Amino acid sequence: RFRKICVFCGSHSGHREVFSDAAIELGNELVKRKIDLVYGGGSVGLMGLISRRVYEGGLHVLGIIPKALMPIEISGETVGDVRVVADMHERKAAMAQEAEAFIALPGGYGTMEELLEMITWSQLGIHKKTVGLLNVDGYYNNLLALFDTGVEEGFIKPGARNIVVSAPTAKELMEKMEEYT
Amino acid sequence: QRSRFRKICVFCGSHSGHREVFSDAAIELGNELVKRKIDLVYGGGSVGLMGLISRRVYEGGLHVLGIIPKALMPIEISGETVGDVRVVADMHERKAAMAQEAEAFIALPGGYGTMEELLEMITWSQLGIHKKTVGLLNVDGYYNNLLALFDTGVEEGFIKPGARNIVVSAPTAKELMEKMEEYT
């Protein structure tokens, strides 16, 4: 049972509506389960969608954003709390300290980087926190295929392949991570 | 031969891979760095692909700088060190110190840690944090799925066309070095 989850996503929504739908459904899963959100502070793209949902649903949202990234990711009007940090490393360390587990929605390089980093910290024993991915309409199939390649070629151990929990919908992913060990 | 680069950081890990082709690739990239008179920045390991590429560059008479968090030393360092070792506090100092020391980055095949380092440096180019060439040595299609994932990000609207070309890619060290020279 979680109280704080960090969700990685970016300031784009995707061309197809299935992505926003996922972000909203994940926001609603966190609301129903009374889970607070930790995220990157943006107010557009999937970041704005999920944080507004959670915030408007009554749960706490904490964004964590570096100073120089604010004019880029925050437009319009924020909701919930925003912690401002010095740089990208402080952002990653603060998001990790604040969360009990991690979920990547679809996103570009930033989101993939954050997710890979959390998987790495689990693999190294740095923390024991669950890492999931919401594999919206196969967006992450190539990522999981890559992990499979890594296992097959001898760069990732079979047991470490199992750190990543994934599912095609927010509902199924939440069930899976409530039950992961 | 002439190069724009004097210092390159190579991401790779403590395993060599089950097939020989991955070790051959690390050695070929070591050879290409030596031919261009390029110094190596890397993670300080002495085993796996990190041990192969660092030993080849050292043996060829170029400088090797390893940057390793103190708690990984017992784990990534074995037998002997290769080149000089700079010890840092944690993962983030290691990443910051490797970027600061390098003019460009190359990922060899590796597991999660190498993937994450590679994606961070791409993200940093995309953001304007730095203006440094990022390459991956796609040994025998190893990174085909990550490049396909980058294509998926473009097609679905999460990565702009221009940001897709940040990642320079080739299947051999020689072709990779050539494409990185020419990147703009």
UniProtKB/Swiss-Prot annotation, chain B:
Keywords: Cytokinin biosynthesis, Cytoplasm, Hydrolase, Nucleus. The lineage of its organism: Eukaryota, Viridiplantae, Streptophyta, Embryophyta, Tracheophyta. GO terms for cellular component: cytosol; nucleus; plasma membrane. SUPFAM superfamilies: MCP/YpsA-like (SSF102405). Its main location: cytoplasm. GO terms for biological process: cytokinin biosynthetic process. InterPro entries: LOG, LOG_fam. Disruption phenotype: No visible phenotype under normal growth conditions; due to the redundancy with other LOG proteins. The keyword Hydrolase applies. One of its GO terms (molecular function) is protein homodimerization activity. Its EC number is 3.2.2.n1. Cytokinin-activating enzyme working in the direct activation pathway. Phosphoribohydrolase that converts inactive cytokinin nucleotides to the biologically active free-base forms. Expressed in roots and shoots. Detected in the root quiescent center and vasculature, in cotyledons, hypocotyls, stems, leaves, stomata, axillary buds, flowers and fruit abscission zones. PANTHER family: CYTOKININ RIBOSIDE 5'-MONOPHOSPHATE PHOSPHORIBOHYDROLASE LOG8-RELATED, LOG FAMILY PROTEIN YJL055W. Substrate binds at residues 76, 94-95, 111-117, 123. Transmembrane segments: none annotated. It catalyses: N(6)-(dimethylallyl)adenosine 5'-phosphate + H2O = N(6)-dimethylallyladenine + D-ribose 5-phosphate; 9-ribosyl-trans-zeatin 5'-phosphate + H2O = trans-zeatin + D-ribose 5-phosphate. It comes from Arabidopsis thaliana. It is found in: Cytoplasm; Nucleus. This is Cytokinin riboside 5'-monophosphate phosphoribohydrolase LOG8. It is an enzyme of class 3 (hydrolase). Pfam families: Lysine_decarbox.
